[PDB]
Scaffold this active site. Structure first.
Site, PDB file in Angstrom:
ATOM      1  N   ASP A 247      12.026  22.204 -13.632  1.00  6.94           N
ATOM      2  CA  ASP A 247      12.538  21.959 -12.326  1.00  6.94           C
ATOM      3  C   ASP A 247      13.120  20.597 -11.874  1.00  6.94           C
ATOM      4  OD1 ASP A 247      13.452  22.136  -9.598  1.00  6.94           O
ATOM      5  OD2 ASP A 247      11.161  22.048  -8.993  1.00  6.94           O
TER       6      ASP A 247
ATOM      7  N   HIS B 265      15.825  23.483  -8.317  1.00  5.37           N
ATOM      8  CA  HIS B 265      15.516  24.533  -7.030  1.00  5.37           C
ATOM      9  C   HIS B 265      16.564  23.996  -5.953  1.00  5.37           C
ATOM     10  CE1 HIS B 265      11.526  23.692  -6.263  1.00  5.37           C
ATOM     11  NE2 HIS B 265      12.046  23.996  -4.472  1.00  5.37           N
TER      12      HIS B 265
END
Ligand SMILES: C[C@@H](C(=O)N1CCC(=O)N(C)CC1)N1CC[C@H](NS(=O)(=O)c2ccc3cc(Cl)ccc3c2)C1=O
Ligand SMILES: [Ca+2]
Lengths: 52, 234
Positions: B88, B42
């Site tokens: 992530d 991210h």
């Protein structure tokens, strides 16, 4: 608690159970000591160690 | 990092800082080797072009131990989803190798089974970064670290307004005002075992910072050890 469940099988780092017995091993950049338990840094700045 | 303490000389040598075109820090990373940095996927959407700084504890002074590295290859997990922050994780390969020295050294990658049975069952881990020191403030000019208790998986799921997948884990405090915060994303969650620090998590997300009844959410590194290994070989 037995083998690896007993104080990490007395290993400095990784503990595995093979055929009812403890087998210690180490992270990259370390060598297993003669006693087959301790991990010895191969060179300077071994991984996972705070510096000085 | 909200609460916690300053990283003192040599205490957090695996910390990496992703800096944008304007030389400002926006995310953390963990040094895995001379060529590789571990971070959050991210974070890759937080800047167009970026570099990696290592050895920096104070972003205001130029000591001489700090070094800037350009990124050669960005390896982002193909299953990363903005919706939930599942998967992530990303690995960065640098153009030039990192010189290890005071305040610059890699964290160890553990073996999966052992990490799950021995590291993640410890009371606490340590999170670090240059993120905000309060939910609404600015980025810290000093590197900070915080001991964070591992949270029971059932408890975490109950506390969360969003899904906690098997690629995530929770750490931190119920009410005590200490947590990672904005800008700490992508940074290290490490666990100490016999004076050796192993990478166990990646700072991922939270419902605010240090909010009552909420915990910090981290990428579960043990679920990606093979992936990481493969990423560091090509
Ligand atoms: C819920 C999540 C959010 O909007 N998303 C994006 C989409 C979504 O709904 N998901 C559940 C994934 C996360 N958000 C909302 C605000 C928060 N941002 S932050 O900068 O305060 C932040 C960032 C990272 C953190 C990491 C830890 Cl370990 C603890 C606290 C942090 C606080 C944040 O991350
Ligand atoms: Ca500096």
């Amino acid at each position: 608690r037995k083998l690896c469940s007993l104080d990490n099988g007395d290993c400095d780092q990784f503990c595995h159970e093979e055929q009812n017995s403890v087998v210690c091993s180490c992270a990259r950049g370390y060598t297993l000591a003669d006693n087959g338990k301790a991990c010895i840094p191969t060179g300077p700045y071994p991984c996972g160690k705070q510096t000085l | 990092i909200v609460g916690g303490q300053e990283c003192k000389d040599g205490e957090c040598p695996w910390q990496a800082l992703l800096i944008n075109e304007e030389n400002e820090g926006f995310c953390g990373g963990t040094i895995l080797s001379e060529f590789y940095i571990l971070t959050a996927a991210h974070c890759l959407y937080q800047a167009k072009r970026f570099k990696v700084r290592v050895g920096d504890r104070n972003t205001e002074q130029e000591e001489g131990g700090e070094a800037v590295h350009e990124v050669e290859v960005v390896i982002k997990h193909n299953r990363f989803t903005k919706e939930t922050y599942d998967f992530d994780i990303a690995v960065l390969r640098l153009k030039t190798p990192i010189t290890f020295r005071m305040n610059v050294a890699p964290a160890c990658l553990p073996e999966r089974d052992w990490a799950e049975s021995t590291l993640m069952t410890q009371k606490t881990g340590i999170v670090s970064g240059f993120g905000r020191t309060h939910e609404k403030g600015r980025q810290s000019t000093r590197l900070k670290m915080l001991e964070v208790p591992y949270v029971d998986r059932n408890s975490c799921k109950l506390s969360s307004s969003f899904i906690i997948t098997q690629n995530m884990f929770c750490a931190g405090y119920d009410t005590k005002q200490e947590d990672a915060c904005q800008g700490d994303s992508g940074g290290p969650h490490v666990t100490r075992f016999k004076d050796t620090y192993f990478v166990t998590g990646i700072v991922s997300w939270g419902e605010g910072c240090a909010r009552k009844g909420k915990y910090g959410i981290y990428t579960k590194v043990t679920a990606f050890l093979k992936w990481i290994d493969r990423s560091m070989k090509t």
